[PDB]
Assembly symmetry: D2
Amino acid sequence: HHMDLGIAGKSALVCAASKGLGRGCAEALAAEGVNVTIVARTPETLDATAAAIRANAGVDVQAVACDITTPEGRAAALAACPQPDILVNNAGGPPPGDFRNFTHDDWIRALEANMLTPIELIRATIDGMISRGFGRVVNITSSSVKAPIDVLGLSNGARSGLTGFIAGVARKVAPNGVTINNLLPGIFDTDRIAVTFDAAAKAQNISVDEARKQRMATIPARRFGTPDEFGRACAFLCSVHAGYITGQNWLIDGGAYPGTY
Amino acid sequence: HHMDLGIAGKSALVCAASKGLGRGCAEALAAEGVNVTIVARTPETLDATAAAIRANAGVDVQAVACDITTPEGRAAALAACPQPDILVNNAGGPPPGDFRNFTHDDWIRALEANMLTPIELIRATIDGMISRGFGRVVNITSSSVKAPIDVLGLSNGARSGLTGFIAGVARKVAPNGVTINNLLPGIFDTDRIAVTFDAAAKAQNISVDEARKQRMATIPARRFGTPDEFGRACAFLCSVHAGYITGQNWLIDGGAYPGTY
Amino acid sequence: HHMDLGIAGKSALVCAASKGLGRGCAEALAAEGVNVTIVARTPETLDATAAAIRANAGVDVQAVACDITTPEGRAAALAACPQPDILVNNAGGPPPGDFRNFTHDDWIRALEANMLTPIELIRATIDGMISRGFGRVVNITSSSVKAPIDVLGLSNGARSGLTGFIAGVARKVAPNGVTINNLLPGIFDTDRIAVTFDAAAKAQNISVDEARKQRMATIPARRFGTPDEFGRACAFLCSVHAGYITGQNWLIDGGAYPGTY
Amino acid sequence: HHMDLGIAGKSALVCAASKGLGRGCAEALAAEGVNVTIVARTPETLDATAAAIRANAGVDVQAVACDITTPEGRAAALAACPQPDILVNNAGGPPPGDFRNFTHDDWIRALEANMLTPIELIRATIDGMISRGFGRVVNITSSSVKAPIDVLGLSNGARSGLTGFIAGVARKVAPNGVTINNLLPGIFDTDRIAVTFDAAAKAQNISVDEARKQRMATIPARRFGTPDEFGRACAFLCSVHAGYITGQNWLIDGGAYPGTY
Ligand SMILES: NC(=O)c1ccc[n+]([C@@H]2O[C@H](COP(=O)([O-])OP(=O)(O)OC[C@H]3O[C@@H](n4cnc5c(N)ncnc54)[C@H](OP(=O)(O)O)[C@@H]3O)[C@@H](O)[C@H]2O)c1
Ligand SMILES: NC(=O)c1ccc[n+]([C@@H]2O[C@H](COP(=O)([O-])OP(=O)(O)OC[C@H]3O[C@@H](n4cnc5c(N)ncnc54)[C@H](OP(=O)(O)O)[C@@H]3O)[C@@H](O)[C@H]2O)c1
Ligand SMILES: NC(=O)c1ccc[n+]([C@@H]2O[C@H](COP(=O)([O-])OP(=O)(O)OC[C@H]3O[C@@H](n4cnc5c(N)ncnc54)[C@H](OP(=O)(O)O)[C@@H]3O)[C@@H](O)[C@H]2O)c1
Ligand SMILES: NC(=O)c1ccc[n+]([C@@H]2O[C@H](COP(=O)([O-])OP(=O)(O)OC[C@H]3O[C@@H](n4cnc5c(N)ncnc54)[C@H](OP(=O)(O)O)[C@@H]3O)[C@@H](O)[C@H]2O)c1
């Protein structure tokens, strides 16, 4: 038994996807027959992930080595995948800090990476989607837009800016068979959080395993998220069964956010 | 290809499901190998839907003819399906009117059908789900909990009451592999909205098609929702790939609700 | 200086107001020249509060000793104050417990007290406000409608039901110079709370002062709310300066709720 | 009667305040005895409004002619008012347009004016507020953060970015007697909307008065907001009676936004 998402043979541009949540989305789309173009900066891991997906899924896989948060990187991605049916927006997130230490340049860099980059990729791909009467955009954001994360003010700001803009464009382009939705991760078991736990353990004189355990104990689901399950939610949003879902912020966080809505 | 939801052979109790959104949920779950018990008041339609799901899905189908908004009906449903892995809560919705004409009996009827009935079925099934380390509850509610519907004050109130309570229990039971989420329909093309469009077309002296087209033009997606796609979202929430999603209100409305969140 | 709220000589019906937040609202309204009818069950305390407001504010004060959560109590309150310009809805809160121990009648009782009671008082007073082109309704609810409180499922449900219904009525009656808003307290230093901390101190063999300080340490403002400041926010909503505020949920909680919105 | 806000003799920096909502905030604070420093680019209207507030309120009024969205302008404002107790953040909003015509520079300018400028003024004033154990920051934003405005994508984005960041800093600084809240205008009767209706009428073959009338008819309160009542709400947030309100988004829109929350 398995659910046909109806997107085999379509094309997807999956940003920041040699590892982690982006990789999970690329894998899940390829599993459903989507030809995927994956983007990341470092060739070694990018080429390896592209080869793995090729050998596991049997779809066409393209790899673009670029910084997606530059105009030149966006142009390189679109040169490889010029008319995507499906766009998964993603890029590395901003550094932590106390708000009094954020510089103007820190703000601009976070806004470029996690707000203006997704917006520009939508701008560059939306006309083709509209012309074909089908389109799916999924933006990987953060629980930070629902409840601010203490040390991640740059995310609290930049990703909330993206989300507020997305609300408008989602409803504007909805008449044309295009949906635009955001996937908001709680804590997911990737290399990104291992850096955070490594520093937290060393500061607290406990093991990383113990620090991870203590964090899990505060999550209602009592675990971290997996890149696999994140990618499956992405694939569902990109399917022919989610065409009546647009402008939505899907929080995938094990219940950690306490708000009713 | 096709995505394996991992719930073949599980049991679901699907309330108010001979027609409409409930039937869509039952069929989508049966398509993934779930043995479904479906509940409705009218035996003829209920038996015909049960027979159709048997013929199409090949799963075990039980049909319980009862009023799910009564304790005798809830007991009869649970007697047939006493340890469901999956509970889909649903019942008929309240009648329209101006708030100054709502009677006390009106309020109790709406609160019983669309708040206390789902709560009682959760109370009666949660301990078995917890003991097995797996459970899925999906409550069919309404866009009325995000933005009040003019003439449906009884829904605006009763379903918001359910949602506020669900927020707490979803997080309370999450440590045990149980998730509880709400699916909020916008306008879906069922028999319930045909009653509204027939009375509109006849009153205004226009065709039903014209009356429906006027409403569609106000929806960003420019169509109504289908019971099939509603059921597919339900099936995803009930899957092994949605275990990190709980306490969430999933609005499926073609972008009609204008709020950013 | 001092801000003239423009409501001197108007009439207010203030429910559940011999003590606590309700008394704070009655005193703040009376300080602005509003003639207040205050309602509580216990005559001794009610009369003492009524006499203190008379002495300090110099307005007309009526005391009605009744149970506002019954139809007979509402009839008595409205007989004494049949055409209020201002209605402050309030009642005792529901008891704590685990949802598996809520009886069906526990739910009915909480729904009657904290949802249907304020709805019926609005229905009985809204026509007069509309006919005069001025009206203010303020409903005392709870932070429980923004984030569920663990042991207060009955509040999480009933007050959320009220709130969803209020959303519709507020926008329905806004053309007639009537506003309807909700005031959502976080933890406020009333007798209800003082009893709770007496139990915590005794259970832990610590002083009441230490038990209270333990809770304050988790609140961003690092204190509890005062009934006075709650009443002042109520009075501002009831003023001629808040006529463009309706359907709003004002959370007054020292930042304790972590959600962005 | 009249309510004492307890802020006579305190100092406020009120940005973008020779006209409109900013002027309304400055006048309301001055009316409660606050010494106000008002900032605007054009000297003619700035000096006239400063003279009016001096004559009306008898407080100290400083006028700074500068563009508050530049570092040099922020520095000039702070030179005049180096240790404000109260900061009202405000600046001119972004131009309208279709999202496909927004340039990278359009985005940066909107982000600078309506997100990074308020953030930098908070960073420059928060230390002193904390050191005195009292502070009030009110950010004038927009209903666009609750529901996107069709042609104002630059606002939908930039002001949502501010709001997501403010959520974190409000809770961070709350232990020190500082509150940070946002005031979200719906449509207010200022010079800003005259330009909007001047274009809306010129294209619709109706008068600006007719276009205004038709827009009013869609607002539940059936009118536009006044700068006076907006300023009064600002003054209440800045008072000693609002110290338990922080991190809140106060929507002042006559009920036009349809969302329950
Ligand atoms: N993990 C969580 O708990 C969590 C939760 C919420 C939000 N997030 C956010 O979700 C996003 C993905 O996080 P993750 O945990 O999946 O991180 P991850 O495991 O480190 O994966 C990041 C991936 O993106 C690529 N990448 C990063 N910046 C890029 C850029 N500018 N251009 C192109 N490729 C880029 C990386 O490869 P290269 O380094 O070779 O480019 C890698 O393939 C981040 O924005 C993160 O802040 C994460
Ligand atoms: N359609 C929409 O646009 C929409 C949107 C939001 C919310 N909703 C809500 O979603 C729910 C389902 O609506 P729908 O459009 O699917 O309606 P529908 O097409 O009329 O189907 C309702 C189903 O529920 C059954 N049912 C009704 N009352 C029952 C009861 N007391 N006990 C057992 N079964 C009962 C009906 O069969 P019997 O009559 O034989 O019992 C039928 O099988 C309602 O609460 C509705 O208000 C609908
Ligand atoms: N304090 C908080 O932290 C907090 C926070 C959120 C919500 N709330 C809610 O706010 C409401 C007021 O709480 P509070 O802290 O102000 O309580 P409080 O200090 O105990 O005052 C309650 C007042 O209401 C009266 N009352 C209670 N039940 C009544 C009834 N059936 N009919 C008429 N009068 C009635 C009481 O007098 P009699 O006993 O003589 O009738 C008393 O005057 C409650 O619903 C509470 O749950 C409180
Ligand atoms: N009116 C509404 O319906 C409405 C609703 C929601 C949001 N808003 C937003 O609220 C803000 C205020 O709007 P409003 O209606 O009050 O406008 P307004 O009547 O045109 O007043 C704007 C004031 O700000 C000053 N100003 C503008 N940009 C400035 C800058 N960079 N530096 C310093 N002073 C500056 C202007 O004077 P100078 O030109 O001489 O500098 C003037 O004193 C805007 O961001 C607007 O988009 C307005």
